Amino acid sequence: SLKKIQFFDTTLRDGENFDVKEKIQIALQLEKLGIDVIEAGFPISSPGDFECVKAIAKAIKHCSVTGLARCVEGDIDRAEEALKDAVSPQIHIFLATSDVHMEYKLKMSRAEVLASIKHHISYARQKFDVVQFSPEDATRSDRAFLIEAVQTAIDAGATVINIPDTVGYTNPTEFGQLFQDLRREIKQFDDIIFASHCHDDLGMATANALAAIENGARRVEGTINGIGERAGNTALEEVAVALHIRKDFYQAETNIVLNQFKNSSDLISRL
Amino acid sequence: SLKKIQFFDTTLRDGENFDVKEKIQIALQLEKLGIDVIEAGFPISSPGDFECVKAIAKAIKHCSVTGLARCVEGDIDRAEEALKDAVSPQIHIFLATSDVHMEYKLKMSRAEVLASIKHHISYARQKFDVVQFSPEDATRSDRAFLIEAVQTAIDAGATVINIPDTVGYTNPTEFGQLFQDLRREIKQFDDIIFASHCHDDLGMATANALAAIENGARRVEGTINGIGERAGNTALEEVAVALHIRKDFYQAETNIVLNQFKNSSDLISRL
Fold first, then answer.
1. Which of A217, A218, A257, B159 has the largest CB neighbor count within 10 A?
2. Do A206 and B202 touch (CB under 8 A)?
3. Are B219 and B163 in contact (CB under 8 A)?
């Protein structure tokens, strides 16, 4: 039917072997496939990444290109530099919101986390019209606080909120509920693009992405083939095919060119 | 916690290359793994199957062995013959319950279907203490009628009801609801073992098996690796690992020896 699901591919990021011309090649196949957003890299991470993100940003003419940044002004500056020639640039910023991460990793309190999010999302918003924000480790976050962190990013200018199952152990019941909670508590929900980024540790990343869509998500992030990370990401091909075959149930359309999926798939496998 | 999930493996059936000694070898690895029921074959289908089912029935001493039969007295006779030396034999009988199958395949009305089910389940029950029944194509069956066919099998002596997503296009929402409906409409539900047999056409077989367990199923049928059929079956390893890792959520135990999963897996892949 009428609701539109966007696709966000992070294949070029979770190459964790791809050389430069190979990244460019993949990127152009992704674009051909009708992927809406290509995450090209994490520019601050190394000079190589920086040049690679620039390279893909220059090659792409028909979709959006994005790069990763922490809540650190330098990363955002570097991403803005990397993406300056993108036809439709975005930036993807993240910060963990779970108790364990805040205590042991960030060494920051809830108040500090919300304050970092507000500052860095606003900071980025001055440079990018489209700011995606991900509360890292969302699925193990205190739920009230997860809602706080997400409201904070929205207030500050984030127009895409991506919910990752960073650990990979959620299920459709638990994840769908997470989205229900966001819908109920975030007044701006219907004006904001919500995405998921599921991991396949338990073999449920596809079901999890679709449960998020049944519950409000209008975007799915993942990879060609579901490669990456420990136990893999959401296989975008599986999600697109489920939406197509059960259009009666999901009532959604996408921009994907279905017949370009095996090209995309064989290319990625080949490398 | 306290509820027990049984595992039903059909690897030796959806070898659709395995030779005789290889089937016996797999069967004994399955048994080692702690699988509760091994479906050894479909005895009526060929004399080879018959001898293979006999062979596995003789080798197995610590779990149950089962074979397939249609609702045809000859199949059941042949299965009874095949399994006569099983330490804990069962039989698995099936009949389609969807409008399309009844019209185009069976060429039988609803009344005829229920009457076949009653007759052949009772027939089998005289020979086997444990009769499993599967309404083939359950997930595309009229729901009221699916409930009729399942009630009929129970009344007639079936103590295990297996719900297959024969076509492979269901999802956790739709499947969980199917189980909710059975629970609400079948007075004997809590006295009857309910299982699922999901297919992985959409990449959701694992999530689907777990959704059936959240909703009353106390048994899961599938294969080592999820091999078989068109697009594969439920990967029993994924289901067992999800139950273990999220015991907090699923609150279930199994009889599986988790550390025997890679042996089982490498054996099956090797062949």
1. A217
2. yes
3. no
